[PDB]
Design a protein around this ligand. Structure first.
Ligand SMILES: [Ca+2]
Ligand SMILES: [Ca+2]
Ligand SMILES: [Ca+2]
Ligand SMILES: [Ca+2]
Ligand SMILES: [Ca+2]
Ligand SMILES: [Ca+2]
Ligand SMILES: [Ca+2]
Ligand SMILES: [Ca+2]
Ligand SMILES: [Cl-]
Ligand SMILES: [Mg+2]
Ligand code: NA
Length: 420
């Protein structure tokens, strides 16, 4: 006579299991006590449905042990809710049912995964230090995985910085860019859960910017030019150098205060004369000159050029009087002055400095001489009106001009006065 319903040992059943356990792992012993003996007391166990995408457990129909019969995965199903039923082999058979809960415990069996498969961007070379470059996010399907981000290769000259945070991993500019040193970076970034990792690559191209001004070779050029030089003489080649690239570094030269006498070639920075120059009119010119790059926006420098005109022997001496006349008594001793000639020369230096001489002239067959620097004409000999009563002397003023010296001549008449 079958008088007792099978009673379970725990009120409902509950168990946890690492997602790791092998096929065969004993999860829970379901136990029931029938209060009879014989077959009135003999129990069979069965799992009942009370939807999960898998059901990786089974119960042994006599022992009551639930074992894993397919590999578990917490990232597929954390929690399984189902039932178990115990039944006696009684001719009127009795049974009871309870619930079973199995919670699956997390193991670190997933790598962190970047949210983008690929990372690419373009930075302007003048991007500010501190500015944001990129935020990278990875995710880990494990519940118990904290993600730390780290810059782990290709940070050349330590240009970039990476703050690791809750959301993800922020890249900033730590130190200034320079197109002349690096056009490109390939930053490795690794996402780690503390044991597993993945490494993303960030391709960064740098666009040259106009971060430099031309710098002239000098802030004050001085060059010299003979007043001789024809129209179209090159007199100097100014240059500025710009550390940028392309148009940002290509120089246009510009006279800021133009004069008719000079022009510049804007591409080559060469200065040419545009007119005849005259030392006797202006000895010096000063120009202010710009070098502008061709960047957007444009930058520029400034220098002064001082142009010194060099004097040329382009002026001939000129006597103050076109004719001189003087007298002396016949009985006068040697070294008696008759008179002093003078000349001027509009040139300076040796070009303007004067020698008075009878050479190329006439000194009355040696009867007179002239002092080279003073121009004073003197008797050299005793005189005789029997012989010469009236000399027609010819004096020369010669400059000391190098390339070829210039001169002028003047007539001096010398009357020899009688003795009563
Ligand atoms: Ca029973
Ligand atoms: Ca798993
Ligand atoms: Ca993980
Ligand atoms: Ca896991
Ligand atoms: Ca520039
Ligand atoms: Ca002149
Ligand atoms: Ca001159
Ligand atoms: Ca002269
Ligand atoms: Cl006179
Ligand atoms: Mg699976
Ligand atoms: Na630049």
């Amino acid at each position: 006579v079958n008088d007792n319903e099978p009673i379970f040992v725990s009120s409902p059943f509950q168990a946890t299991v690492l997602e790791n356990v092998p096929l065969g792992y004993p999860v829970v012993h379901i136990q029931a006590v029938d209060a009879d003996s014989g077959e009135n007391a003999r129990l069979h166990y069965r799992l009942v449905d009370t939807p999960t995408p898998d059901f990786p457990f089974q119960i042994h129909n006599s022992s009551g042990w639930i074992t894993v019969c397919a590999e578990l995965d917490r990232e597929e199903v954390e929690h399984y809710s189902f039932g178990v039923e115990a039944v006696d082999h009684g001719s009127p058979p009795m049974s009871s049912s309870t619930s079973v809960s199995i919670t699956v415990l997390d193991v670190n069996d997933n790598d962190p995964v970047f949210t983008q498969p690929t990372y690419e961007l373009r930075l302007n070379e003048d991007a500010a230090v501190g500015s944001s470059v990129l935020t990278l996010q990875a995710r880990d399907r494990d519940a118990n995985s904290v993600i730390t981000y780290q810059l782990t290769g290709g940070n050349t000259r330590n240009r970039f910085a990476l703050s690791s945070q809750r959301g993800g991993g922020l890249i900033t500019l730590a130190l200034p860019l320079d197109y002349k040193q690096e056009q490109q970076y390939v930053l490795a970034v690794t996402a780690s859960d503390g044991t597993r990792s993945h490494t993303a690559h960030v391709l960064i191209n740098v666009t040259d910017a106009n971060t430099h001004r031309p710098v002239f070779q000098s802030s004050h050029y001085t060059v010299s030019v003979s007043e001789d030089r024809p129209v179209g003489t090159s007199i100097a080649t100014l240059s500025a150098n710009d550390e940028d690239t392309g148009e940002n570094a290509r120089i246009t030269y510009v006279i800021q205060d133009p004069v008719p006498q000079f022009r510049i070639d804007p591409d080559s920075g060469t200065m040419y004369t545009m007119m005849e120059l005259d030392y006797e009119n202006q000895v010096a010119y000063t120009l202010t000159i710009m070098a502008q790059d061709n960047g957007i926006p444009q930058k520029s420098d400034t220098t002064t050029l001082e142009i010194l005109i060099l004097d040329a022997n382009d002026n001939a001496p000129q006597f103050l009087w076109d004719f001189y006349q003087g007298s002396i008594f016949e009985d006068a001793p040697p070294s008696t002055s008759i008179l002093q000639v003078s000349a001027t020369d509009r040139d300076s230096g040796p070009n303007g400095r004067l020698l008075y001489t009878f050479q190329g002239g006439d000194d009355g067959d040696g009867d007179f001489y002239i002092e080279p620097t003073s121009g004073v004409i003197r008797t050299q000999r005793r005189l005789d009106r029997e012989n010469v009563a009236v000399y027609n002397l010819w004096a020369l003023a010669v400059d000391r001009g190098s390339p070829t010296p210039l001169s002028a001549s003047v007539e001096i008449q010398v009357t020899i006065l009688d003795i009563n």
